[model samples]
Each structure stands twice: as C-alpha cells, then as structure tokens.
Target: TMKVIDPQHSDKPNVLILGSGWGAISFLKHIDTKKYNVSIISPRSYFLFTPLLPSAPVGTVDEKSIIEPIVNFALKKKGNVTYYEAEATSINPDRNTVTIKSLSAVSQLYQPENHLGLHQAEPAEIKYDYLISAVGAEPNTFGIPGVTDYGHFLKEIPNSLEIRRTFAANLEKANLLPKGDPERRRLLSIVVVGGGPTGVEAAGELQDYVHQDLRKFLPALAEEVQIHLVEALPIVLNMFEKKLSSYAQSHLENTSIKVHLRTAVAKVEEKQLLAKTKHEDGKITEETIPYGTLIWATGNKARPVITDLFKKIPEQNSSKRGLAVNDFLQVKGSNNIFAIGDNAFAGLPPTAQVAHQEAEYLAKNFDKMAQIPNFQKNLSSRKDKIDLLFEENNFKPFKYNDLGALAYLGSERAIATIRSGKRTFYTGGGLMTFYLWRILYLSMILSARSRLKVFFDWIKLAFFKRDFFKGL
Candidate 1:
C-alpha cells in the first residue's frame, strides 16, 4: 500500500517526518528507526526554546543560546533517521506522498546536482510509508495593520533583535528631543498588546532592563519610559486562575506599568495605538497611546503553506484547527504519520507543553513500530546494549497536560497557575514562586548545555547590567 524511493538506498521501512521543534525532536530522539529508515524535513531545522526567547531580544542572551540545529542533532543520530531541512508544501493522502520545497537556505545548500530524473528541484515529491508532520506555528498577527511591518514581535531571535534595536534607537531619539516636547516623550513609550504570558514576560524584562540596568546608566530618560499592557479582555493572564491573573496585574501596577482592560487594539499607527471602547452611555470613544516600541503577543494563526496542504487532503478535513491527528498522534486516517507542537494546535492547543506531550507520545509509538526481530540488534552494532528507555505504547489521545504557566511582572516578581495532577496551585509573585518558575523551566530545558547557557545568560544579565547591543 506504500512506495518509498530512497536516494540513500537504505532498505528499511521509510518514515518521513517534518518539523524541528520540541515535539519533533523528542519523537526523533526515540523513534526506533531500526525497522524504519527515517527522514525529517523542515524549512527551519532548529529547535527553539520559545519560553526564554525574551532574553535574546534584549541582548541578555545571544541567538545561538536558544537554537538547536536539527541536522547537527540528526547527523550524529543512529537507527537510520536522516534529515532534510525542507518545507512540506502539500500532502497527497491518496498516494501517501508529500511534496516538499527547498525555499530555505539549508535545503538549497543540501540540494545536489540532479541526474537520472531523480532531481528534487524547487518542489520535490517524497514518498513514504509513514509521515509525521510537526511543522511548528508562528506568532499570530491577527490581520492588524502595521503589526507585520511595524510591530516589534518576540517569538524568535529576529523578533527579539528588532525590539531591542528599536528601543535603543528610541532612547537615543528621546535623549536628543527638544525639552518640553510631549511627542518625544511619547516616542519613547512602550506599548505591549495581549497581556498573555509572552506579553507579561516581555514587559517585565523591558522594565528590568530599563530600571535595574539602564536606570543609573541613563537617568535622563528613566522616568520618561512608559509601558502599556493592553488586552482585548478585561483581564491579563486570562488563561490562568483569577488569583494568578490578578497577581500579574497587581505586579504590573506596582511598577507603574499600565494595564488597559477591554482594549481591543483598533489600529496601530506609526507612533500611536488607537482603540475604541464603549462608554457608560454606550457611545464608543477612541483612545490612543503613543509608543516607541510595540510588542505583539496576540496568539497565532494558521500558516498559509499548511492551510494549502489541506486542499487535497480530505482526512485533514478539520485540519483547519491546526492539524487533524489521532490518539497515536498520527494524522487522522493516515498510516505512519503524526503531528506535534504549536503548528499542531489543530490537534491540540498551541503551546510548548502540548508540543512536548505529543513528541513524548509519538517517540514511544515510533520505537514500538521499530521493534522488529533483529532490527535493534543490528542497529549501530547494538553491541553497546543501546538502552533507550521509552514509555510503553499507549495509543491515547495526545493529552494537553497543564503543567501551568508563568509570567514575570517587573522587580523580581511573577505569577503562575500550576496543575500538579488534579490540584491547581496559584502564585501571586514572591521570591519563592519566582524561584519555582526558574526551577521548572530549568528542568524543562532541552539539554545540559542549554541549561548551562541559560544559567550563564541569567547571571550575566543580572550582574553586569544589560548591554546596548542593537540590530544585526
């Protein structure tokens, strides 16, 4: 029922996997590729620890500190799982095949001279017995004008750098403006939309960088910096428990960071953010906050390329939510395929935890699939008694386990709602709670190296004061 063409000439069952996030990495790490020769394709072949991305934007941490190159992880991998850093353009479910395109620099470099009619040029057709789609998601712009071109986002390295550079440049501009110029003061204000965990975290970091780090360095603009946390809903941290949400709100208030409730950002101007709210008389009035930098953390939207794949895939009927997949993490009604991570929000809500859970589950199933006789024995000589521990195959629905969420709120404070089993614990910002947040993510970091790197960055940022590095 399946056909596979291996340029590498491996005779094992072929498994084609996509994506390079935590979910895909976990699956790749444990997929018992002894029975299946695996190939992974993704436009961006790196795993980014998204939670800590805030530090990178402010130059507290470098880009390399957060990215784990997928190929580098794959090349050293055994059990016959190779990697191709390409983007999956479409899925031909009828033929159990996928078309991948080399629009990325990595894919372009890996593309070889084509001969024998097997050349995979711009768009390449790759057939597989199993396909796992773990393509991750991106920041949700929400069709807001100027959000794409003018907004300062904080999902990846570039986003962080843009924010850092713009803020720095504004500080210089603010310092140079004529005295008594209200517009110049407005030009240095910071506006953050969608007070979700990301927004809260960024706001807190920016405050810290400005006060603790840059305060003594630039006393002239210390009191001039304005930070606004605007949310459509009446509350910040809406997903967290009320106590936790209020705690984040209170902490923001304590720091003079304004929290605007029911503020749906109507439009983002070059220098002002305008929103209209209903007054007591049911009349709508416009409110505008001029800003030097605007950070957008308004959630996510479907990737255009992924939405395009669903056209030919009826099994992906509900893939509109993200991706349609089964309890085994396999794409619904398809064999040897699965989805994970935020891009998989169609299968599960878009979050790092969801991606992690899906990855953990898929890895176990992959290992079970590779448990053929003598397959493990001959895998990488198998002489060392490769003891890769895995959870027993549990074809259960990809559970979105709530490990809870945390957000910083300036001045060594934070709030969180944690579910440790059925019991939910809420925090309203304390040293211990902040410590707990740090400890949790420390454990969540992918590797010992990543842990070390984050630790180093935190210590450096906390000690030497933040640097003024801006732009690439």
Candidate 2:
C-alpha cells in the first residue's frame, strides 16, 4: 500500500500545485516528497504529450498512446503526494487557501464519497503553506468574428478527437455526393489556421493521412481532399530559421497542401472562411475559402483564473500576456506564490520546453529550501525574508536553457533547430530529421508504457496504415 501524506495531519509544509501539464508534472516528479506534502488540483488527470498531438488526430499516433495518467505516472512513487481531479476556481493568497470545484466524475474515483457531493459538488477550500500556479493558458481567438463558434481548437485531447471525428465524418458525408458537387468540394477541404508548429504539423499530418492511408481506401475521395494552411505572417514556423521555414513551406506546397502566407482569416463561417491576403506589391485581396473542417491553432492567452488573480494583485495590473513573475518565478506582489509555465510571463515563450525547465528549477529550489532548518515556518514569511533565505542558501535564479525544437513535416520529412551551448545549428527536410524528431519525441514520453505504445503506434501505421473509421 502507498503511504500517502495527509496534509491535515502532517508536520511537513503543504504545497498545493494547480495544474497537471508539463510544469506541474515535471515539478511533481522532482520535488522531495519527504519534505513537503504535495497536493495537485487540475481539470485534467492525465499529462498529454502535446508535441505528438498533431500525429494523434490523423492516426499517425494513437491518442491514448501519448497521454499518461497523472496519479499513475507522477504520484505513484511519491508517497506524500495527493491528487485532485478538479479546477482551482480561485486562490486566496492572504489566507493561503485555494478554492476548487471538483470534476466530480473523475474526482469520485479517487476521493471519498463524503469529500464530494454527487455530480455537482460545492466548492471546497484547501490550505497550503506554498502555492504553485501552473494552470497554463487557453486558446486565443483574438476576437475574430465567428471563430469561437466555428473554429476547431487543437489544445487538448478532446479537440484532437473532435477534429478527427469531424474530418472523417465530413469525408464520409462527401462520399455521398456527386463528383462535381460544390458541397462535395467544400466537404473535402480542410483549412488549418495559424503558422506555428501546431498548425504546420497538423496540416502535414492531415495531408499525410489523406495520401498515405486514406487514398488506398477511398481513392476518389482522397483525391478530392484539400488542405489549406493559412498564416498571417510571411512564413510558417516563424520562430525557426528562415531556411527551415522556407523548406517547410515549400515542402508543404510540394505535397499539394495549399500554403497561404501573408494571409489572415477575417471571419469563419460554418462551411467557409473569409481570408485577407497581402502581396509584396502592396495590394490586398480577399478570398472566401470553403472548408469542411477548420483547425485553429493560433496561440494562447491568459486563463480566466490568471486574469482574476491579476486583478487581486495590483503589481500584476500591467501584466497583459500572463502573470508577471520575478527572477525566481515568484508571482509579483504575492508571498508564498509562484507561477510557472504559460501562467507566468517571465520573458519566455509559452512552450513545453520552457515549462519543463521552470518546473525543474522550482523543484530543485524547493528541495534546497527544505534543507534549511525551520523552512516550513518561513514558507509564508514576508517577501524580504524569503528573498534573504534564497540568498543565504545560494539558490541561483532560474535560467531557461534552449533545448531547440523539432517539427514533423510529413512524407518522411521534418525540420530541426538544434542549440548547443553558444552554438546553434539547423538540419532537416528529409528522412533523417524525421527519424530524429520521432526518436527525440519518443524518448521525451513521460512513461515507459507510453513510449512503447507510441513506438508500436508508428510501427502499426507503417505496416497496416491508419484506420478510416470516425472516432466515437
């Protein structure tokens, strides 16, 4: 039996973590459970391997293969950790308490019956000596008309599932119409918005699915399928080097996936989107592109909880993108509160690499702090005291090391930007980089089970190809 820590009865300082994403899981995996009683509260009970998310939607990888249950993966060996499948509704910094609404169905599986009421439970409060906010950002629609209502987001598992189901259903529906039917044409077109890694990878995956697998089964329908990649910027993968971005764009175009650069979606409708294109000649053209499915992967914005917390703290008033943090990732104007990942705007891009590093830094910092005698007593102390403690302990400021990035471009191709100390190098657009991307991502899987499953998924895809049925 696992010896779990009871925060209510334990002498160890209670640390409440508010997420299960990259940041929270990384921190949980590294934190010394003997020194701190850790409790996690998050809407998701699983840690999603987001880098391979694009592969899942089109059957390049299985959805279940990329996700690891938080309790089993992160908390199983950590005896002092407790898991709560819930949303942190609000945080009371002054009282060192967080209010959470139980995601009853999942919470009921782990929590006692008395702990949560049926389906709709009253909000419960949990007190903590320290709070770590890792509640990542949400998809940003940028107030585009009809986007929220019509566009499909690609942030979570359900979004990918929905995209898969919708795409397959549209194909099935399109097959029912005549070859020249306009409706058939519209039903076969897939428009992917945004030019970042998510959008580019998603488009590449969809196109691969159509040509590599679906074409063998539904030859005519596959031939009719068109994928349009829309990017407001002049190039996709703008974060990458210009050569790599150009290679990706040209490679995508060569695969017959329409690459629309310098184009922005003005509005989205049920079956079509209005896009504006700017040419080098200083002219703008508007085109109404019809699509059966729209996958929106633009970017992220602060979640409501972050916004609410910002309002509660005056120092965070000027923080627009996310919660402003100091060098140590401590939330400004709040003692005993630290924010990491996409929740904190600490001069870092909202990427998994950044979040993982931040979490590791915090975990190490926490471990070091625990070494000090009477550390628990000083957890909730004034800001200066905490700073002095950090200073005295020689706790170095958090520094993010760029580990570089990789994006799969389909057809046994990919792009890699590698950073090694002071030197940086780029290589890609072939089978070698594709294998590199796969191996690196496979190794990055949190669990051995997930890694083996994902590997088999790739093997299966290569052997028998992807399935055609819509996801339930």
- Local accuracy of candidate 1 as per-residue lDDT tens digits, 254-301: 887888877778888788878766655666778877788989988876
Among all windows of 10 consecutive residues in model 1, the one with the lowest summed lDDT is 382-391
Point out where model 1 deviates above 4 Å.
1-8, 103-121, 278-283, 345-348, 372-394, 425-428
lDDT of 1: 0.70
**Clash numbers, per candidate:** 6, 0
Model 2 clashing-pair count: 0
RMSD of every candidate to native, in Å, equals 6.2, 3.5
State residue 296's C-alpha deviation in candidate 2, in Å: 0.3
Return the clash pairs for model 2, or none: none
Q: Which ten residues in a row have the lowest lDDT in candidate 2?
A: 108-117
TM-score top scorer: 2
lDDT, candidate 2, 1-472, per-residue tens: 2112234666788888999999899888888887887788888989999999988888888888899988775445444566777798888777778877754533322223334232435566778888999999999999898887887899999988889889888988999999989999999999999989999999999999999988987899999889999999898998888998989988999999999999999998888899999998989999999999999999999998888888888898888899988788888887789999999998888999999999999999988878787566676455436755666777789988997989888888999977866677755557899988888998888888889999999888778987545744
> What lDDT does the true structure give each of the candidates?
0.70, 0.84
How does candidate 2 score on lDDT?
Answer: 0.84
What residue pairs clash in candidate 1, if any at all? 57-160, 131-336, 131-337, 321-346, 322-346, 323-346
Tell me the TM-score of model 1.
Answer: 0.86
